[PDB]
Amino acid sequence: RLTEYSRTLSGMESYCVRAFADAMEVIPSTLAENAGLNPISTVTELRNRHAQGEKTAGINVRKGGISNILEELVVQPLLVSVSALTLATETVRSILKIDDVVNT
Amino acid sequence: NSGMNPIQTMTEVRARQVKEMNPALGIDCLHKGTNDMKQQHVIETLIGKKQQISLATQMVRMILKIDDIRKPGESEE
Amino acid sequence: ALWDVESGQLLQSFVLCLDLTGNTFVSGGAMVWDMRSGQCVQA
Amino acid sequence: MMDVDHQIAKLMVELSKSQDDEIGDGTTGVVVLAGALLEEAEQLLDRGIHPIRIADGYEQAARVAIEHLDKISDSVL
Amino acid sequence: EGPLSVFGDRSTGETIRSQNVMAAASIANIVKSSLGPVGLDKMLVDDIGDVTITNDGATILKLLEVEHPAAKVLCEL
Amino acid sequence: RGKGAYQDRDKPAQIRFSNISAAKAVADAIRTSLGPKGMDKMIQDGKGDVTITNDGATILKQMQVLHPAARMLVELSKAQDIEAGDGTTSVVIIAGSLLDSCTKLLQKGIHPTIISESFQKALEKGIEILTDMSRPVELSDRETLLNSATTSLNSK
Amino acid sequence: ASLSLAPVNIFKAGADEERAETARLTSFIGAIAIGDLVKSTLGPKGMDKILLSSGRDASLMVTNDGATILKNIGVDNPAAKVLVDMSRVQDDEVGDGTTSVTVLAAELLREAESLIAKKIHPQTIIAGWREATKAAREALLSSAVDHGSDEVKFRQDLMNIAGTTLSSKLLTHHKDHFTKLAVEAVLRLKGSGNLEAIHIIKKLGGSLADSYLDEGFLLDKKIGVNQPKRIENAKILIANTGMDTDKIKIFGSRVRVDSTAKVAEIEHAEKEKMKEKVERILKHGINCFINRQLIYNYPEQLFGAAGVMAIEHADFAGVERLALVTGGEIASTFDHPELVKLGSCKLIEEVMIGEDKLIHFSGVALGEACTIVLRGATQQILDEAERSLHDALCVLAQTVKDSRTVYGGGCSEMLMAHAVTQLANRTPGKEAVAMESYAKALRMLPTIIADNAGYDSADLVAQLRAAHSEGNTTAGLDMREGTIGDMAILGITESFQVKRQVLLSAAEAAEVILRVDNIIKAAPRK
Amino acid sequence: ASLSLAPVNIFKAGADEERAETARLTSFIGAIAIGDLVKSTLGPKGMDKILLSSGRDASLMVTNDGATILKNIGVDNPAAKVLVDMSRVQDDEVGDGTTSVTVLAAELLREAESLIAKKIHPQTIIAGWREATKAAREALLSSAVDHGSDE
Amino acid sequence: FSHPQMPKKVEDAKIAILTCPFEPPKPKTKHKLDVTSVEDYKALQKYEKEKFEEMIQQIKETGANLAICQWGFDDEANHLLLQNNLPAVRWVGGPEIELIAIATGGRIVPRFSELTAEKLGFAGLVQEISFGTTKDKMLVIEQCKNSRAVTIFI
Numbered sequence A: 001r002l003t004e005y006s007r008t009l010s011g012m013e014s015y016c017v018r019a020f021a022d023a024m025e026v027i028p029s030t031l032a033e034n035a036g037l038n039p040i041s042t043v044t045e046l047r048n049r050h051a052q053g054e055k056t057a058g059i060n061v062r063k064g065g066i067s068n069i070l071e072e073l074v075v076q077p078l079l080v081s082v083s084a085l086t087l088a089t090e091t092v093r094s095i096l097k098i099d100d101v102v103n104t
Numbered sequence B: 001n002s003g004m005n006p007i008q009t010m011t012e013v014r015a016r017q018v019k020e021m022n023p024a025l026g027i028d029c030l031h032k033g034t035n036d037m038k039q040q041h042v043i044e045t046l047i048g049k050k051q052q053i054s055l056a057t058q059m060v061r062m063i064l065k066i067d068d069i070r071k072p073g074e075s076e077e
Numbered sequence C: 001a002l003w004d005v006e007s008g009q010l011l012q013s014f015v016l017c018l019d020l021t022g023n024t025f026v027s028g029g030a031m032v033w034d035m036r037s038g039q040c041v042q043a
Numbered sequence D: 001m002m003d004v005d006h007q008i009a010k011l012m013v014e015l016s017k018s019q020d021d022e023i024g025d026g027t028t029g030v031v032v033l034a035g036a037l038l039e040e041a042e043q044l045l046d047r048g049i050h051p052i053r054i055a056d057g058y059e060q061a062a063r064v065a066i067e068h069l070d071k072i073s074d075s076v077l
Numbered sequence E: 001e002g003p004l005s006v007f008g009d010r011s012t013g014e015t016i017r018s019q020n021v022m023a024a025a026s027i028a029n030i031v032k033s034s035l036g037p038v039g040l041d042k043m044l045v046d047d048i049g050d051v052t053i054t055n056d057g058a059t060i061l062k063l064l065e066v067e068h069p070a071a072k073v074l075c076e077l
Numbered sequence F: 001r002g003k004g005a006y007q008d009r010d011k012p013a014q015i016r017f018s019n020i021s022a023a024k025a026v027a028d029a030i031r032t033s034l035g036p037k038g039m040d041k042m043i044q045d046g047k048g049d050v051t052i053t054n055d056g057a058t059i060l061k062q063m064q065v066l067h068p069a070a071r072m073l074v075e076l077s078k079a080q081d082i083e084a085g086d087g088t089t090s091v092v093i094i095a096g097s098l099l100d101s102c103t104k105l106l107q108k109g110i111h112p113t114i115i116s117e118s119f120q121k122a123l124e125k126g127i128e129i130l131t132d133m134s135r136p137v138e139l140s141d142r143e144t145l146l147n148s149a150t151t152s153l154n155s156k
Numbered sequence G: 001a002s003l004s005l006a007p008v009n010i011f012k013a014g015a016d017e018e019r020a021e022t023a024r025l026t027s028f029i030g031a032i033a034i035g036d037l038v039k040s041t042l043g044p045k046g047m048d049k050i051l052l053s054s055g056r057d058a059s060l061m062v063t064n065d066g067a068t069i070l071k072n073i074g075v076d077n078p079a080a081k082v083l084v085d086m087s088r089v090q091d092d093e094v095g096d097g098t099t100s101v102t103v104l105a106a107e108l109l110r111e112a113e114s115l116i117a118k119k120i121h122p123q124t125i126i127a128g129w130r131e132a133t134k135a136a137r138e139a140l141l142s143s144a145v146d147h148g149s150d151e152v153k154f155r156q157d158l159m160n161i162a163g164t165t166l167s168s169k170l171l172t173h174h175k176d177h178f179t180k181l182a183v184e185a186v187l188r189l190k191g192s193g194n195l196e197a198i199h200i201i202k203k204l205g206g207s208l209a210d211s212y213l214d215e216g217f218l219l220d221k222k223i224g225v226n227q228p229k230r231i232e233n234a235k236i237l238i239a240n241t242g243m244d245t246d247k248i249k250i251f252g253s254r255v256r257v258d259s260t261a262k263v264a265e266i267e268h269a270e271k272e273k274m275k276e277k278v279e280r281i282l283k284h285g286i287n288c289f290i291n292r293q294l295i296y297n298y299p300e301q302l303f304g305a306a307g308v309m310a311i312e313h314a315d316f317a318g319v320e321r322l323a324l325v326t327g328g329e330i331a332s333t334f335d336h337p338e339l340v341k342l343g344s345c346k347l348i349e350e351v352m353i354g355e356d357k358l359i360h361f362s363g364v365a366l367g368e369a370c371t372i373v374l375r376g377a378t379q380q381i382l383d384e385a386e387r388s389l390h391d392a393l394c395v396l397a398q399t400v401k402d403s404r405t406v407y408g409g410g411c412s413e414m415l416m417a418h419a420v421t422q423l424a425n426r427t428p429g430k431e432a433v434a435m436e437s438y439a440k441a442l443r444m445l446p447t448i449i450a451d452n453a454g455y456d457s458a459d460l461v462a463q464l465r466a467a468h469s470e471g472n473t474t475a476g477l478d479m480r481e482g483t484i485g486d487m488a489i490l491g492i493t494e495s496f497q498v499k500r501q502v503l504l505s506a507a508e509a510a511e512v513i514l515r516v517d518n519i520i521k522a523a524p525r526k
Numbered sequence H: 001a002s003l004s005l006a007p008v009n010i011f012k013a014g015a016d017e018e019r020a021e022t023a024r025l026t027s028f029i030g031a032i033a034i035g036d037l038v039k040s041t042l043g044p045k046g047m048d049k050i051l052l053s054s055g056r057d058a059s060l061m062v063t064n065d066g067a068t069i070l071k072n073i074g075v076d077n078p079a080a081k082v083l084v085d086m087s088r089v090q091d092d093e094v095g096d097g098t099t100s101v102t103v104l105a106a107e108l109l110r111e112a113e114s115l116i117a118k119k120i121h122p123q124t125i126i127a128g129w130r131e132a133t134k135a136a137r138e139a140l141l142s143s144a145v146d147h148g149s150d151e
Numbered sequence I: 001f002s003h004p005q006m007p008k009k010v011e012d013a014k015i016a017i018l019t020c021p022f023e024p025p026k027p028k029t030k031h032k033l034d035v036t037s038v039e040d041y042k043a044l045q046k047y048e049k050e051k052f053e054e055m056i057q058q059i060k061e062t063g064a065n066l067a068i069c070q071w072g073f074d075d076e077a078n079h080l081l082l083q084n085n086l087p088a089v090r091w092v093g094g095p096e097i098e099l100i101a102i103a104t105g106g107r108i109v110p111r112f113s114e115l116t117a118e119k120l121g122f123a124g125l126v127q128e129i130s131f132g133t134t135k136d137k138m139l140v141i142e143q144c145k146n147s148r149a150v151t152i153f154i
Ligand SMILES: Nc1ncnc2c1ncn2[C@@H]1O[C@H](COP(=O)(O)OP(=O)(O)O)[C@@H](O)[C@H]1O
Pocket: G041, G042, G043, G044, G046, G066, G096, G097, G098, G099, G100, G163, G164, G165, G166, G167, G168, G169, G408, G409, G410, G449, G477, G478, G479, G492
């Protein structure tokens, strides 16, 4: 969705929003890598299935592929994801504002 | 190096190259007012570019294939 | 720092050595502090 | 002129020497191209691609680029 | 040393797994010869001449000086 | 027009690159312990104390990182633990990935303030998307609570 | 012959001295280094700095405040020490301006070095700078505008001043929300300058936009065991009594009996005395009891039996803030209940902020004491937000004291420099050159502001100079897109006190440093 | 990321490098120091220096010549070495003007530092200086007079 | 001023300069007071309370508006001073005590029982001065009748 949003934001900020989306893509790749699956193909399959319409699709470590993640009863509260995203964004902005290191 | 915005100028030049079929459009480093590098007479040998690409690719492949380093680590004087 | 022995709580935090009525004490590095006001009173 | 210990840095120095020996020009473009190639290979490796696959893709793309260079070349007297 | 910048040593993967298995095997081999009716006792000298002739595994593992974490895990087990 | 400000000082760029590299290194270090197939890390203190853990906040706190960006990442994981208590590993990975993208974004010639503002816009859009894709829950539904607890305990 | 460069040695081992060239060079290098360090953190597009402590704790601090940067650096250059003390004093006197005064002093000293290179006596430069400072001060005073009579315009000026102060800090992300927060917090002081009455609580986690100014008050203390955890229509009694085995203050007294039964009787008498103390306290008809010192187990058991909340160990600041917010009187004796005023609030309850529990006072009577909850992602973010809020509150309190305001964005510097140039154009001698250098530094300030944003600083400063010479006295830098605009329309306003203090302190320190022609150092202790 | 400020180290022990700000600062400091030293020996009222050798011979020289002063000093600043070589080559080509050329180079580099401080690309400064040098050379050539015909 | 809720400005202040802490008296000689019964404890508590009340009443009886001490005082005396509309300052240094006595034309009194109206100093204005955003406060005593001591504030 953020890739689409960046596509709708022609300008200089479109590149930054697309980079933001690509960075968000990291966690599924890490899950696939840890599960022993092929990361590139698994993430591509996830993206294709999500684009097709189904949004409850995730890594199925038990089966070894991609399926409806609600079938495996893998659910988490929205607060975890919202807080993680918000805190990470604020930390990134605060770090980006820094340009010098002074030793005391 | 010429003081222009890299991404913007490069994207504009690439779009112009795609639009009209002209592979001679490049970066106007000297600010002559034109991007057509053939008119500016910026010419370089074909074999030079081919050798650049070949050497870079072979060195990158050779470096990518090294997965272990065994250094003496003695830090001799 | 001065701590309450019975309750195990930090009464007030303010020094190689110090010495002390358990209200006015002097700390040397003089620095006399009064617990009734929590301020330096003599130097 | 550089005084380096890292073996990859010595490889880059030798790459520049090779470009100087064979062509005599473009000894700086080769290093920049190799650095960019390895920088892209870094993010390709972070996504779980075997470095041999990256090298093979780089070789295929280099072949395509060399053929394109042959296509878009011009002859001078 | 590197980009992580942690004041210490790091071992990852097969290296640390083999280290843990080696420590566990060392602890097992210490007491493996004292099992069953045809087992034999051991002398333990406590650096000041104190002698402990024992066959119990717990006594041997408590009296020993153990440093590796996995070895400590087996001793406390 | 043509040439803009020369930017005679390259030190700010070097500082930004070093900060990003440190954050990316921390994220790469803790990536291995993510998800149900993640593995625990042994951390031995300077005093000899030993801890085995998969919790991201505990891992970040135990190893005394030195680079300032790593310390800010540790504080970020601690804040995530305080506010949520779960996801202390995902947030550090997200921050590291964002700064890794910032590397190429800055290399392309984009001012850091523009990157930060665009990241804020993307954050707002992502919050909207995540809220849209979620579903309500009632505390009287024991099955959902059990599933959430099991999902939390899968990686441990 | 010089003192050091003489055949006979007159110094202890390790003591040296620096004559004309060396003294002036050391002073100028130190001042320029300090100014270059503190700058690039100036203006709306200034960046932050990371301060790594070299101590065992290795404290981490990212900040934009100039005074904070200059305090936590190991400085050995004496002129750099002078500039650091200047910045610290500027921070003490007013909130903002710590970076501006340092940069102005550094630019003045750079101009002084250039003038000295042109064979101009430093005393001539000092006289020229004194005249230039007089002219600039007169111009700045004449350009001041006051809106203290009108409440709506004064509130608009307060909003603009808070926004301008916060524009350079990490709070510029939520500038609007934080400006409203700071303005409300300052206005709740009811005209008092007590900045200690505003308490800032930093809680980790959450977003910066989640920060808020509580409508009542928040206390980080704890309630007793059997005491109620929720009081409606509370009647507060703030006290500063012992309540922990309150011994009779005759320190020469002792219990000297011949049996243990008498000892038991005496301890029962002590417990009865404490119970009578609690009864006298309860005679006031109260629901809540905040004591500055500790409350031991017996008094808290008595309070729980009485069913009244008893908050203990609220330090001097705590009891002062509670008295300000609830209107109570800090009482240490309870023999005249009619002479003691009781604090009042609509509701007392425990709130759950983050993972910590705090006592919340709602519907306070007076409210002349604020608590601000700051939420952030890192401890560094929280510290920087607290510092930025302190700057904003300090500037707002100063503006409340003195309502005269000037226009920021380089407008004040431009008009002062224009006045200095006008004075220099009718002055003979090298004093005119010194005045021109003074005006050059005044120009250099908004030049650095524009440089920090990556704009064409030279062209923008030339445009500002032309506009101010023409008569556009309100022209200034428009930092939204990099043009010039009307600072009155854009609402870029500052406190007149802050700008005047920056100007005067910078000129004074530059004059002080310029007078030195010999630096003599004693042998260090090490 | 630069070679020096990278997590991995790419240099020998004792080898280093100075990036944009540091390199420009070192060059400007060295050039300005050389120019300030050689000056004050310029013009009819210039004064002489004392060159006290630190070697075993401990040779003593008193000179007003810029090239002689510049060649007999141990300079580690590479830009100082460039200026010293310039003065030596000027002395080789013609017998006069070593102090003048060194001072002119130092003043030009000081102005270059001032221009760089104002966010001006060094290539722009170089182009402007080339145009200025052309104009000044043409003016000097037009200003010259000749009297070789008249004895 | 010792109490935070005490007024920050006194006009036509009649100052009582004192060198005795507002505390129960204690002999300099090594002394032990024996409590042998409940009646003794009650009498001691009553004596302490009455001493506090008596010293405050003695200070108030002279008509003084301001009280200046050298050795500080404790909570009960502070609250009684606030309750009786007597602004007070504690822990004032000896040289400062002498200068205040010289300027205000008042005598230095070593104990409350010796306090009289004729020993009170006079000051036209006693004020507490703030110094911006610094939290530090200072006290200014000026507008004296025929002050024979001056201070220069830089
Ligand atoms: N919105 C704005 N537009 C133009 N100039 C601004 C704006 N906000 C702040 N400034 C300028 O930035 C300068 C530096 O302010 P700041 O860095 O916040 O504190 P300090 O005055 O201590 O440096 C001020 O002199 C002010 O004139």
